[PDB]
Specification:
D-Maltodextrin-Binding Protein, domain 2, binds a molecule of 3 linked components (GLC-GLC-GLC), Maltose/Cyclodextrin-bd, four-stranded mixed sheet, alpha/beta, transport, Maltose/maltodextrin-binding periplasmic protein, carbohydrate transmembrane transporter activity, 23 helices
Length: 459
């Protein structure tokens, strides 16, 4: 369904998709080829479902951590840049898009979280995490708060979890050891325990998400946030005089954010592989194309040597790279998505007091290499489950409360009912998710078996 002779691109909604569209309207202005830029919700979860059916985009943009799983699933075309083009990008970015010795995507830009602070509220940002509670007590007297950031995505809390010793998968003897997971060790527990103590002492709210924290910082209600380069654009538009600096230390050790390399992969099922090769090598990864995107939403430290040189003088980019050097490059192994789902649940349940830090991380450690059926097939289940009330009755009193049950029933359509149902699942642990799978098996076995079958077809 990917029609030949055009280019469809998926990029995340927080990136500069209008800047990328400008690169595509010039590509169309030169070669006659139309390119459409799209930013669907959960594109990175849907791509494995739509690529295998000959749909989805020609080019998918995401951070490199998802790409090893796509490559293992046969969903990405091997990219064959010349040795002369490879020299235009830094070698460590090519390493991030290398899976089994082969290049599976084009590196675009290096991303790391930084501490972003309001210089009018906070001329001297805290050097340590341990200072933040006293800061917040001082700024609550003025009607403000110290810090707000997204607690719903584990990416934003990971720098604190890794500071004192948490890690994802240990790199040993040239490869990531998936039997050596570090999310429930003492250092991980110490970091998450500090986060929980911030919530307990009313220095943070467990409900804070991306838009709440962005709105709070950009309206001058909070003195700091934690975010990446893509967010700077909306702060420039605000009236906030902001700085970008090193993340606070924790127990005297740097916060260790996971470093992402924004990357562009080519659908293995695309009949436009060489039109995507030419758009990526000759129109995006130029100084002109990267500036069209970076001027929409900043990219961070771009992988193209010639343009990075120009932008490296930005103190915001210098701070991004200081944080990046204290952190670690994300693995790209297929187990990363299961790892992220496991840590999302642990962080959300610890923050809300539904689990202790110890229990939440112990559960995450056990599940870090196994991707659950309903997480893998969320979008297809929303679209294709037909008897929602039967699932609701099977979950009532085990996994669904009456307040949750009523919220789902109040939704008008089956996809919107399932959407609402799935909005509760980040807090469910493995056995709760198993209950939904067993209910689906009893009422719609053909659907489960269909999804299982197509997943195995990728191996
Ligand atoms: O929490 C569930 C979530 O886990 C996985 O998402 C992770 C991304 O794979 C990972 O790249 C990182 O995402 C951040 C991007 O790197 C960055 O460009 C920017 O957009 O912020 C993103 C975080 O919001 O971290 C997330 C985990 O937080 C998995 O791929 C998702 O499908 C899954 O929903």
């Amino acid at each position: 369904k990917i029609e030949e002779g055009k280019l469809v691109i998926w990029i995340n909604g927080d990136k500069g998709y209008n800047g990328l569209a400008e690169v595509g309207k010039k590509f169309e202005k030169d070669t006659g080829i139309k390119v459409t830029v799209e930013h669907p919700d959960k594109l990175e979860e849907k791509f494995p479902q739509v690529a295998a059916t000959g749909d989805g985009p020609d080019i998918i943009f995401w951070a490199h951590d998802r790409f090893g799983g796509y490559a293992q699933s046969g969903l990405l075309a091997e990219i064959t840049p010349a040795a002369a083009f490879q020299d235009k990008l830094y070698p460590f970015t090519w390493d991030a898009v290398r899976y089994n010795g082969k290049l599976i995507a084009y590196p675009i830009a290096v991303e790391a979280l930084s501490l972003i602070y309001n210089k009018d509220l906070l001329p001297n940002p805290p050097k340590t995490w341990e200072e933040i509670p006293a800061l917040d007590k001082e700024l609550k007297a003025k009607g403000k708060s110290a810090l707000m950031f997204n607690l719903q995505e584990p990416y934003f809390t990971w720098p604190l979890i890794a500071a004192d010793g948490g890690y994802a998968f240990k790199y040993a003897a040239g490869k990531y050891d998936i039997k050596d997971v570090g999310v429930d060790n003492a250092g991980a527990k110490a970091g998450l325990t500090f986060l929980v103590d911030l919530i307990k002492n009313k220095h943070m709210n467990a409900d804070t998400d991306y838009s709440i924290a962005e709105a709070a910082f950009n309206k001058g209600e909070t003195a700091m946030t934690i975010n990446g380069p893509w967010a700077w654009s909306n702060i420039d538009t605000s009236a906030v005089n902001y700085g970008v600096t090193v993340l606070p230390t924790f127990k005297g050790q740097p916060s260790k954010p996971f470093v992402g390399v924004l990357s562009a992969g080519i659908n293995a099922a695309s009949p436009n592989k060489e039109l995507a090769k030419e758009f990526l090598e000759n129109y995006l990864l130029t100084d002109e194309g990267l500036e069209a995107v970076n001027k929409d939403k900043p990219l961070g430290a771009v992988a193209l040597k010639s343009y990075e040189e120009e932008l490296a003088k930005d103190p915001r980019i210098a701070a991004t790279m200081e944080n990046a050097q204290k952190g670690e490059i994300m693995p790209n192994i297929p187990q990363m998505s299961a790892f992220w789902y496991a840590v999302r649940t642990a962080v959300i349940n610890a923050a809300s007091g539904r689990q202790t830090v110890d229990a939440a991380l112990a559960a995450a450690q056990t599940n870090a290499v196994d991707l659950h059926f309903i997480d893998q097939h969320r979008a297809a289940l929303i679209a294709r489950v037909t008897n929602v009330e039967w699932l609701l009755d099977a979950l009532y009193g085990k996994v669904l409360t009456d307040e949750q049950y009523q919220a789902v029933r109040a939704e008008p359509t089956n996809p919107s009912k399932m959407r609402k149902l799935f909005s509760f699942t980040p807090a469910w642990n493995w056995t709760c998710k198993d209950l939904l799978l067993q209910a689906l098996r009893e009422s719609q076995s053909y659907l489960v078996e269909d999804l299982e079958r197509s997943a195995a077809a990728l191996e």
